[PDB]
Amino acid sequence: VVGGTEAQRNSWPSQISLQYRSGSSWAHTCGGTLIRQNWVMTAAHCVDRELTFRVVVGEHNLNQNNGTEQYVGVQKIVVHPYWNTDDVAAGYDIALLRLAQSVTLNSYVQLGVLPRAGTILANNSPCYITGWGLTRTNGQLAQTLQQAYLPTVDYAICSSSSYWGSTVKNSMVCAGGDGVRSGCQGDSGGPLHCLVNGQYAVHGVTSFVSRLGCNVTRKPTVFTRVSAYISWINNVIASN
Numbered sequence: 421v422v423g424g425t426e427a428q429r430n431s432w433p434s435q436i437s438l439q440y441r442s443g444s445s446w447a448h449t450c451g452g453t454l455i456r457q458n459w460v461m462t463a464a465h466c467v468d469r470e471l472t473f474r475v476v477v478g479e480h481n482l483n484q485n486n487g488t489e490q491y492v493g494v495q496k497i498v499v500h501p502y503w504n505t506d507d508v509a510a511g512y513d514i515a516l517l518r519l520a521q522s523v524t525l526n527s528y529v530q531l532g533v534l535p536r537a538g539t540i541l542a543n544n545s546p547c548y549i550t551g552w553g554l555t556r557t558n559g560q561l562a563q564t565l566q567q568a569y570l571p572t573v574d575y576a577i578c579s580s581s582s583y584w585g586s587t588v589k590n591s592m593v594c595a596g597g598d599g600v601r602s603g604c605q606g607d608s609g610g611p612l613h614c615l616v617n618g619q620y621a622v623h624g625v626t627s628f629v630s631r632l633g634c635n636v637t638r639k640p641t642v643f644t645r646v647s648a649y650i651s652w653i654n655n656v657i658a659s660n
């Protein structure tokens with residue numbers, strides 16, 4: 421997250437860190453959202469590589485013991501069947517991960533609430549992106565979980581020619597694009613939290629930014645629109 425602030429450690433208890441095994445260690449690669457005690461929602465592109473993955477819930481500082489973490493292996497990966505890795509602009513950038521164990525819920529570990537199917541945010545709706553991604557274009561990962569305020573940009577504006585044009589689809593949410601705050605590499609797969617009727621819900625799964633940089637004016641961060649995938653999500657969990 422570029423232009424973020426450090427999150428309080430109990431603000432976003434559904435945020436997870438998706439990590440892969442790297443030699444004798446583990447490395448953060450993506451975010452995700454805990455949606456059941458044994459299921460995580462992330463981006464499909466995060467799990468393209470044939471790596472060994474684990475999820476960390478209750479994580480705040482990637483580089484220090486928080487005293488709150490639970491580490492669980494990924495047992496099954498279900499990518500959206502229409503996902504195509506060399507065409508992120510087509511959409512379907514979503515995957516579900518079944519965890520090897522069910523995690524224990526507490527003030528640091530909670531299920532993300534998802535929007536009702538079909539919900540579309542009005543333009544300029546208040547949302548936060550969260551994650552441990554790069555803090556500058558071509559920079560380095562954050563140590564501590566970051567948040568940035570990214571108001572939505574509706575489809576009509578986002579798909580206009582000076583924004584993303586044809587690359588953005590109605591199955592996506594755009595947010596930000598002010599040139600200061602944005603998602604960045606390592607935030608993919610994580611949540612966009614939007615306040616609706618008094619309650620935060622996870623409306624987006626972080627999908628892509630511009631090849632020109634993370635924080636680029638009129639290139640808002642683009643997210644998979646979770647409310648377009650409610651039936652898919654429920655069908656996968658019910659059949660696994």
Ligand code: NA
Pocket residue numbers: 479480481482483484485486487489
């Ligand atoms: Na930690």
